[PDB]
Design a protein around this ligand. Structure first.
Ligand code: HEM
Ligand SMILES: Cc1c(C)c2c(c(C)c1O)CC[C@](C)(COc1ccc(C[C@H]3SC(=O)NC3=O)cc1)O2
Length: 453
């Protein structure tokens, strides 16, 4: 069977078809035109974009396909290094760091993080309680304050104190510019053109800002008199059983950057999308708010109570269905093989999973895929099989999935308990792309219910 492919432009291949600050959304349109799979070429690389659960199910067979470092991950590696997100599965430091850091996401560890998550969540609530009537909330900006500070405190006993800053934290500003640069590099035909010299200088400056922050985290741990057993403790003290060696210093720095960035950006996106869909679906908002009030009966939430916020969890999963904030992951063929009994692949051929398209496969989800309907997830028998992949696949799946969802469920529950939300601008959804996805310009007003904290 012939591989669908969009129009090419000489030696620029398909690259002119993007030329946009919203490439994933452009690729979704192409997927809608060409179906479950299409080839996409740029100068120097080829990708096959998958959109159907039928093909993606096969791609997730780890006996035939392994995680690929997409060009995007290769660019992000310029500051993620060989951390968990940007290392090959057979790169020694991936398995070594995975074994050393997996205990930091056990159930017992999660319970240990709860109190610190509440610390930051309380700061978010208090900020909104203290706004004057003429003010409003910048949603993604405040969700970023919350999620960055949470991973900073839980993972590294470091306080970014983002709620003590009225502009984005400098680490965030450098992160956004670095992620934007990586995304933009995917589309530029002549990367060595002098017109990009300033981009390269800024990219290095933003990488330095990140590493100056890592220095403070390491210095502050060295000076601490308290005893921690958090993510940073495992980075520093965990051993490879085979060699008796810890992660080398260079890798540790990369893991810190990896977890600070990967450990908050997509969770901020999730919370922003969730609040967007809530204010656009008032009956769903009422049901979620009713659950929050019913379950969160104490001055602050306990770990167990967060687990009883079932419908809030459905809201979050349904937000991830429509707009998975890490919208793609990449695989490569371990050997020559045939995909879906139709598409021959050669060893090393790249398959890119378009998660937003997977999550809109009507043969799986029904015809109403564009509706925000958390009840999709209320009746177990009616939820599809391997059709929902916001956290990746297999042994390279998200290590922090339960960290993210516990944080998001806790915070969204507290938000719904303490405020009524008004979409005072009738905001039109505008999804900013920085590889990851997040609403931009999303503002609301929050009227306190005056419930003490
Ligand atoms: C909505 C929130 C999040 C989403 C949607 C998400 C999604 C993903 C996805 C799709 C992958 C796989 C990417 C690939 O296959 O190349 C991944 C990997 C990873 N995520 Fe997340 N993630 C989230 C939050 C977090 C958090 C909070 C942390 C840490 C605190 C984290 C740590 C990681 C790590 C370490 C990996 C790589 C694991 C490995 O390959 O060994 N993520 N994430
Ligand atoms: C949890 C998490 C993940 C997984 C994460 C990132 C963050 C910040 C996270 O919090 C950053 C980007 C990145 C390293 C990579 O995300 C990608 C997004 C899109 C793509 C697709 C390429 S194909 C194209 O032409 N346009 C793209 O963006 C690849 C990777 O992933």
């Amino acid at each position: 069977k012939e591989m669908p492919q969009p129009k090419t432009f000489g030696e620029l291949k398909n690259l002119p078809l993007l030329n946009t600050d919203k490439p994933v959304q452009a690729l979704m349109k192409i997927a809608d035109e060409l179906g479950e799979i299409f080839k996409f070429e740029a100068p120097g690389r080829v990708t096959r974009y998958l959109s159907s659960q039928r093909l993606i199910k096969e791609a997730c067979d780890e006996s035939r396909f392994d995680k690929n470092l997409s060009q995007a991950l290769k660019f992000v590696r310029d500051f993620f290094g060989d951390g968990l997100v940007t290392s090959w599965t057979h790169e020694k430091n991936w398995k070594k760091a995975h074994n050393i850091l997996l205990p930091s996401f056990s159930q017992q560890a999660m319970k240990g993080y709860h109190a610190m998550m509440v610390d930051i969540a309380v700061q978010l609530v208090q900020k909104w309680e203290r706004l004057n009537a003429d003010e409003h909330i910048e949603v993604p900006e405040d969700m970023t304050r919350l999620t960055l500070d949470t991973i900073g405190l839980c993972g590294f006993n470091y306080r970014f104190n983002s709620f003590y800053r009225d502009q984005p934290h400098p680490f965030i500003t450098s992160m956004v510019r670095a992620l934007d640069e990586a995304m933009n590099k995917l589309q530029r035909a002549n990367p060595d053109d002098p017109a990009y010299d300033e981009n390269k200088r800024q990219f290095q400056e933003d990488i330095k800002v990140m590493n100056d922050l890592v220095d403070k985290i390491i210095a502050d741990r060295k000076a601490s008199g308290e005893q921690s057993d958090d993510l940073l403790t495992h980075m520093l003290n965990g051993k490879d059983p085979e060699t008796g060696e810890p992660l080398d210093d260079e890798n540790i720095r990369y893991q810190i950057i990896t977890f600070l960035i990967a450990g908050h950006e997509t969770t901020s996106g999730l919370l922003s999308f969730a609040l967007y869909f809530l204010v656009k679906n008032p009956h769903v908002l009422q049901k979620a708010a009713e659950e929050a009030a019913r379950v969160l009966v104490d001055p602050v939430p306990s770990y167990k109570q967060v687990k009883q916020l079932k419908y809030v969890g459905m809201v979050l999963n349904e937000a991830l269905r429509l707009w998975p904030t890490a919208p793609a992951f990449s695989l490569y063929a371990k050997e020559d093989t045939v995909l879906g009994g139709e598409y021959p692949l050669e060893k090393g051929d790249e398959l890119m999973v378009l998660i937003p398209q997977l999550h809109r496969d009507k043969t799986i989800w029904g015809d109403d895929v564009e509706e925000f309907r958390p009840e999709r997830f209320e009746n177990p028998s009616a939820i599809p099989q391997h059709a929902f992949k916001p956290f990746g696949n297999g042994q390279r799946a998200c290590i922090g999935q339960q960290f993210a969802l516990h944080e998001a469920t806790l915070v969204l529950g507290m938000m719904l308990k303490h405020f009524d939300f008004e979409d005072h601008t009738n905001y039109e959804l505008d999804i900013k792309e920085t590889l990851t996805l997040k609403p931009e310009g999303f503002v609301v007003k929050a009227k306190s219910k005056k419930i003490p904290l």
